[PDB]
C-alpha cells in the first residue's frame, strides 16, 4: 500500500480515446437541437420540476455526469451562453466534432502539441477570415435589427411570435443606455427585469414603460390610480428601530412609562412630517412600515409600499430616475419621484400588481410575460434572454456575419487555400479542422432531413466560386441559399467566441494524458 489507497489512475491513448469518445457522446446528445428545424427538449430536474427548452446550455446546465471532460465541456457551454447566449445551439456540436476528427491523428502517432500548434494558427486565420467577410450595419435602423433579431430568433418556439419579441427585445434594449460614462454608456440586462405571469396569451405580454410590482397598497385609503405621482424610495425601515447600543431605561416615576410610549409615537410621527414636507405621493421601502405612520401617510393620502426587493427598488429608482434614501431628514428633492407618467395597481386575477407607466425617458424596464404556464413562460424568456443579449452585442459591434453555414464554408476553403500553401506535416491538421467546420450546415441538413452529402458537396462546389459568399443553407427548404435575400444574419462577435471557444476546448482536452481520482480534501 503506497500511493493514495483506492484512487484510480489511467494514462495515455486509452485516456485519449476515452475523452475523445465522451465528447462525441457529449456533442451527439444535442445534435438534434440546432436550426430553425430543430427539436425541443423537456427535462426532469432531480427534485420533480419540469423544464422544456431548446437552448443547449440549460440542457447541459441540467446534466449530471461522471466523466470530467463532459463537465469540462459543460462549463464551456454555459460560459459562451453567459457571454453570448446562443450559438450554444451550435458551439459544442462544433466542439466535439472538432475533437472527433482531432483524434484521427492520434493513431497517426502525431504529437498533439503540433496539432495544437496548427490549431492556434488555424483560429488566427479564422478570425481574420470572418473580419474579412463581416458586414457592419447601422444601429439606428430598427427594421434590420428586427430582421436581425428574427434572424436571431427564428430558431426557437417563439418563432410564431417573432414580430412581438423583436420589437419587445429592441425597445427594452434601446431604453437602457447609461450615459454618465461619457459616450461610453453601457446597457444592463439585470435592469432588464423579466416578469412571467401565466394566463392570458403571448399577444397579451408586452413591454411596460416602467416597473411591475407583485405587491399591494398597504392601506385601502391610498388611491390605486394616479397620473403623475411622486415616489419615495426609503432604504431604511419606516418604524422604530433598535437603539443599537443595548440601550436600557430605568424609570422610577409613574408618568415616565406612558411618556416614553408617546415618544416612540412621537419618533414615528417625526418621520412622517419629514416625508410630507417634500409633498411626496408614493412611498416605497424594502423594510416594514408602521401602520401608525401609515395612518399618518394615509392621513396625508400618500401611497405607501413596504418590504420591496432591493433590485426592484433600484429599477424602480431607475424607472422614475429618483434615488433611494435611508434618511427622511436628509431626503433630498432632487430624488422626488418625478418621471412618473401613470400610477396604478391592477388586479391580475388573485394578485394585485403595481403599475408604473410613462416615465419620460425611463432607463429601467421590466418585460411582462403573460402566457399559458410558467414552464412555457420560462422557456420563452430564455429565448428572450438570448434575443436581447445578441442585440446588445449588436449594440456592442455593428459588424455582422451571414450564418447558415455560409461563412463556415468560406473559411473552410480559405483554410484550404491556406492549407495547400502551408506545406509541412502541420498541413494535414490544418485541412482537418477545415474538414471539421463543414458539419454544421451538414447538421442543419439532418434537422431538415435532406440529402446531406450531395447538398454539401454542391455547397462546397457552390462556394468554390469566389464571386459568392452569402450562399448558405435554408432552414426549411434544405436548399442552397444566398443569405442576402434569406436574411438570417448574425453578430460577428457571436461567431468569434464561437470559434474562439471551440478551439480553446480542443487544446485543453488534447494536452490531457492522465486521470486521477479520490483526492480526499
Amino acid at each position: 500500500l503506497v500511493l493514495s489507497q483506492n484512487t484510480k489512475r489511467e494514462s495515455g491513448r486509452k485516456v485519449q480515446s476515452g475523452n475523445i469518445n465522451a465528447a462525441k457522446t457529449i456533442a451527439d446528445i444535442i445534435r438534434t437541437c440546432l436550426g430553425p428545424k430543430s427539436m425541443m427538449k423537456m427535462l426532469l430536474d432531480p427534485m420533480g420540476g419540469i423544464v422544456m427548452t431548446n437552448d443547449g446550455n440549460a440542457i447541459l446546465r441540467e446534466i449530471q455526469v461522471q466523466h470530467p471532460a463532459a463537465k469540462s465541456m459543460i462549463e464551456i457551454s454555459r460560459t459562451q451562453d453567459e457571454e453570448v447566449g446562443d450559438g450554444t445551439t451550435s458551439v459544442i456540436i462544433l466542439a466535439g466534432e472538432m475533437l472527433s476528427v482531432a483524434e484521427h491523428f492520434l493513431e497517426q502517432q502525431m504529437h498533439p502539441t503540433v496539432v495544437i500548434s496548427a490549431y492556434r494558427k488555424a483560429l488566427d486565420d479564422m478570425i481574420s477570415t470572418l473580419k474579412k467577410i463581416s458586414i457592419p450595419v447601422d444601429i439606428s435602423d430598427s427594421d434590420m435589427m428586427l430582421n436581425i433579431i428574427n434572424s436571431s430568433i427564428t430558431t426557437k418556439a417563439i418563432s410564431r411570435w417573432s414580430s412581438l419579441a423583436c420589437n419587445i427585445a429592441l425597445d427594452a434594449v434601446k431604453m437602457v443606455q447609461f450615459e454618465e460614462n461619457g459616450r461610453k454608456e453601457i446597457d444592463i440586462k439585470k435592469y432588464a427585469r423579466v416578469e412571467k405571469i401565466p394566463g392570458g396569451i403571448i399577444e397579451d405580454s408586452c413591454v411596460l414603460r416602467g416597473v411591475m410590482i407583485n405587491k399591494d397598497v398597504t392601506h385601502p385609503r391610498m388611491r390605486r390610480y394616479i397620473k403623475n405621482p411622486r415616489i419615495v424610495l426609503l432604504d431604511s425601515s419606516l418604524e422604530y428601530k433598535k437603539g443599537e447600543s443595548q440601550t436600557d431605561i430605568e424609570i422610577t416615576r409613574e408618568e415616565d412609562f406612558t411618556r416614553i410610549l408617546q415618544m416612540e409615537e412621537e419618533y414615528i410621527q417625526q418621520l412622517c412630517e419629514d416625508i410630507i414636507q417634500l409633498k411626496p405621493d408614493v412611498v416605497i421601502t424594502e423594510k416594514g412600515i408602521s401602520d401608525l405612520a401609515q395612518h399618518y401617510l394615509m392621513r396625508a393620502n400618500i401611497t405607501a409600499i413596504r418590504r420591496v426587493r432591493k433590485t426592484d427598488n433600484n429599477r424602480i429608482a431607475r424607472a422614475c430616475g429618483a434615488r433611494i434614501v435611508s434618511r427622511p431628514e436628509e431626503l433630498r428633492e432632487d430624488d422626488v419621484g418625478t418621471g412618473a407618467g401613470l400610477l396604478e395597481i391592477k388586479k391580475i386575477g388573485d394578485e394585485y400588481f403595481t403599475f408604473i407607466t410613462d416615465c419620460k425617458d425611463p432607463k429601467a424596464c421590466t418585460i411582462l410575460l403573460r402566457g399559458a404556464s410558467k414552464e412555457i413562460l420560462s422557456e420563452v424568456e430564455r429565448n428572450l434572454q438570448d434575443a436581447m443579449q445578441v442585440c446588445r452585442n449588436v449594440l456592442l459591434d455593428p459588424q455582422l456575419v451571414p450564418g447558415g453555414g455560409a461563412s463556415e464554408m468560406a473559411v473552410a476553403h480559405a483554410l484550404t487555400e491556406k492549407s495547400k500553401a502551408m506545406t509541412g506535416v502541420e498541413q494535414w491538421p490544418y485541412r482537418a479542422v477545415a474538414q471539421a467546420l463543414e458539419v454544421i450546415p451538414r447538421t442543419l441538413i439532418q434537422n431538415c432531413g435532406a440529402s446531406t452529402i450531395r447538398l454539401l458537396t454542391s455547397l462546397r462546389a457552390k462556394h468554390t466560386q469566389e464571386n459568392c459568399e452569402t450562399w448558405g443553407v435554408n432552414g426549411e427548404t434544405g436548399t442552397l441559399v444566398d443569405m442576402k435575400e434569406l436574411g438570417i444574419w448574425e453578430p460577428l462577435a457571436v461567431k468569434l467566441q464561437t470559434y474562439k471557444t471551440a478551439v480553446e476546448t480542443a487544446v485543453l482536452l488534447l494536452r490531457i494524458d492522465d486521470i486521477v481520482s479520490g483526492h480526499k480534501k
Binding site: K71, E75, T79, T113, F178, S245, E250, D514, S517, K521
Partner: protein, 532 residues
C-alpha cells in the same frame, strides 16, 4: 517486538522506498520539457483540476508513505523557491535515488554513497559557476522574452508566449521596487492576476495598474472616475459602537431621541469629514452601511466594502494612499488629511464576463501592473495563472540574479562527462557513486526524448559526443557549445535558440535533490504503528 505494528528492515524497506519513489516519478514523468503533457485529477466529486506543475499535482495528491511525502513537500519547497523544475526536480530526486540505491543494492556502504554525493553536488555547482552565462551583456528584454517563452514551453500557453512573455516582462519592470537601500528588489505576487473565463488569451489584457475582483456597492452610485481622488480606510463605517460593554441606561427619557440621533451622526460626520476633503474613491475591508451608501450617492462618490487586505496594501503602495485603520491626529481629535489620499488617472468598474470588476489605471505615485485573464473554462484560467505565477518568479529571479543558464537540458549533458572525468580524481570507491550520480543525472534528456517519443539514446549519444567533444581540444571558444532540441528531434544551440533557464533553478534543484536522497538513502528500517 512492539504492538500495533511491525517493522521491516534492510533491503526490504530499502527497495520499498525505492519502489515508492519510482512510483512518484512516473506520476509526473510526462509533463516536463517543451513536450511534457499536463495532468488532471478528478477530486472525488468532479471538482477536477487540470495542471502540469507537480507541486500543485503533488500538493493535490494524497500521500501516506513517508518517503514520497518528502518528495512532495520537497517539490513544494522548490516551488516555494523556484516554481518550476517541478517539471524536473522530483524526477531528479528519485532517479538519483534509483541509481544510488542500486549500488547499495549490491553491497555499497550508504555513508560512502552520501559522501560522494556530497562532493558531487559541490563539484557540480562549482562547474555550474564555471559554465555560467550572464544576461547583463545580453539584451534584458530579449532574454527575458527568451527564458519566459522557454518557461512558457511545457505550459498551456506556450504557443502565445511571445505575446505573453512580452506581457509578462512589462509587468515585472512595472513591478520594480527599491529594496534595502542598495537593491532593486521586484516583489512577486504583488502583481494582481484575475482569472475570467470567456474571451481568448488573445484578448487577455494586462492592467497598467490594478484591477479589482469587486463591484460598486450602490447601483445608483456612479461608475467611473477620471480623477485621482482615492482613499483606503480599514476603519469600517457603521453607527459607532460602545464596542466593549458600555450600557446605556435611561432614567430621563427626554434625550433618547438625541441619543439615538447621534448614534449614526458619528458615522455621518465621519462621512462628512472625509467627504469634505473631496476624496472621490475609497475602500474599506470593513462593512459599509447603507446610510453611508446613500450619503455617497448624494456625493456621487465611489466606495468599496470588503476588499481583501493585501490588495489595498498594494493599492496604498500603488496609488500613494495611506491605508487608514481609523481617523485620528497627533492631537486627540480624529482628523483627516488630503495628504492621506491615493492618486491615479482613472478608475472604472467594468463588467467582464457580465460581471463588473473595478479597474485602476496608472497610479502616479507608484506604477502598478495587473493582468486580466481570458479563457474558455474556469479550469483553463486557474492553471494558466499558475504558469503565470511561475512565469513571474523565473523572470524575477533573472532580475534577482543578472545571470542565465541555457535551457533544454544542457546542464547534465555537460555535468555528466565533467563529473565522469572528475570521478577518476578521487580514486576511492565513491567515484562509482559519482559515476551513477552523473549516470542518474542523465535522466532528463531521456525523459525529454520519451516525452518527445523518439530514439532517446542516440540523441543522448550525440549530446554525449558534442559535450564530450566540448571536453576535447581546449580551444573551445569555437569548440564549447550548448544546446539540444526535441520538436525537430536533434541538438542545437539553445543559446542561439534562446532556450534559457535561471541558474538558481538547477542550483537549488541539485542541492535540494542532494539533501533529499541523503535523507532517504540512510534509512534502513521502517516500523509501523496502528492508531488508537
Amino acid at each position: 517486538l512492539s504492538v500495533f505494528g511491525d517493522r521491516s528492515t534492510g533491503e526490504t524497506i530499502r527497495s520499498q522506498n525505492v519502489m515508492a519513489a519510482a512510483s512518484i516519478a512516473n506520476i509526473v514523468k510526462s509533463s516536463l520539457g517543451p513536450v511534457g503533457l499536463d495532468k488532471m485529477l478528478v477530486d472525488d466529486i468532479g471538482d477536477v483540476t487540470i495542471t502540469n506543475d507537480g507541486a500543485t499535482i503533488l500538493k493535490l495528491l494524497e500521500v501516506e508513505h513517508p518517503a514520497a511525502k518528502v518528495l512532495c513537500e520537497l517539490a513544494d519547497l522548490q516551488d516555494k523557491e523556484v516554481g518550476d523544475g517541478t517539471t524536473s526536480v522530483v524526477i531528479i530526486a528519485a532517479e538519483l535515488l534509483k541509481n544510488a540505491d542500486e549500488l547499495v543494492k549490491q553491497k555499497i556502504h550508504p555513508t560512502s554513497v552520501i559522501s560522494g554525493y556530497r562532493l558531487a553536488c559541490k563539484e557540480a555547482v562549482r562547474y555550474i559557476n564555471e559554465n555560467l552565462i550572464v544576461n547583463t551583456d545580453e539584451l534584458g528584454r530579449d532574454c527575458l522574452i527568451n527564458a519566459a517563452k522557454t518557461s512558457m514551453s511545457s505550459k498551456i500557453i506556450g504557443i502565445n508566449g511571445d505575446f505573453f512573455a512580452n506581457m509578462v516582462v512589462d509587468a515585472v519592470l512595472a513591478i520594480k521596487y527599491t529594496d534595502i537601500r542598495g537593491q532593486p528588489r521586484y516583489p512577486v505576487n504583488s502583481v494582481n492576476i484575475l482569472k475570467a473565463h470567456g474571451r481568448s488569451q488573445m484578448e487577455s489584457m494586462l492592467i497598467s495598474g490594478y484591477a479589482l475582483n469587486c463591484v460598486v456597492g450602490s447601483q445608483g452610485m456612479p461608475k467611473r472616475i477620471v480623477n485621482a481622488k482615492i482613499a483606503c480606510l480599514d476603519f469600517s463605517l457603521q453607527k459607532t459602537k460602545m464596542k466593549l460593554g458600555v450600557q446605556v441606561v435611561i432614567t430621563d427619557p427626554e434625550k433618547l431621541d438625541q441619543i439615538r440621533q447621534r448614534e449614526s451622526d458619528i458615522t455621518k460626520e465621519r462621512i462628512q469629514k472625509i467627504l469634505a476633503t473631496g476624496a472621490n474613491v475609497i475602500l474599506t475591508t470593513g462593512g459599509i452601511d447603507d446610510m453611508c451608501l446613500k450619503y455617497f450617492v448624494e456625493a456621487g462618490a465611489m466606495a468599496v466594502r470588503r476588499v481583501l487586505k493585501r490588495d489595498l496594501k498594494r493599492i496604498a503602495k500603488a496609488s500613494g494612499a495611506t491605508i487608514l485603520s481609523t481617523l485620528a491626529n497627533l492631537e486627540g481629535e480624529e482628523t483627516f488629511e488630503a495628504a492621506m489620499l491615493g492618486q491615479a488617472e482613472e478608475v472604472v468598474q467594468e463588467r467582464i464576463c457580465d460581471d463588473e470588476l473595478i479597474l485602476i489605471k496608472n497610479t502616479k505615485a507608484r506604477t502598478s501592473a495587473s493582468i486580466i485573464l481570458r479563457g474558455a473554462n474556469d479550469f483553463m484560467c486557474d492553471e494558466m495563472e499558475r504558469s503565470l505565477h511561475d512565469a513571474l518568479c523565473v523572470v524575477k529571479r533573472v532580475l534577482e540574479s543578472k545571470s542565465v543558464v541555457p535551457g533544454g537540458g544542457a546542464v547534465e549533458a555537460a555535468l555528466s562527462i565533467y563529473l565522469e572525468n572528475y570521478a577518476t580524481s578521487m580514486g576511492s570507491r565513491e567515484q562509482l557513486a559519482i559515476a551513477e550520480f552523473a549516470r542518474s543525472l542523465l535522466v532528463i534528456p531521456n525523459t525529454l526524448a520519451v516525452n518527445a517519443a523518439q530514439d532517446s539514446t542516440d540523441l543522448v549519444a550525440k549530446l554525449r559526443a558534442f559535450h564530450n567533444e566540448a571536453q576535447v581540444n581546449p580551444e573551445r571558444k569555437n569548440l564549447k557549445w550548448i544546446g539540444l532540441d526535441l520538436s525537430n528531434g536533434k541538438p542545437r544551440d539553445n543559446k542561439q535558440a534562446g532556450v534559457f533557464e535561471p541558474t538558481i533553478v538547477k542550483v537549488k534543484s541539485l542541492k535540494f535533490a542532494t539533501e533529499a536522497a541523503i535523507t532517504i538513502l540512510r534509512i534502513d528500517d521502517l516500523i509501523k504503528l496502528h492508531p488508537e
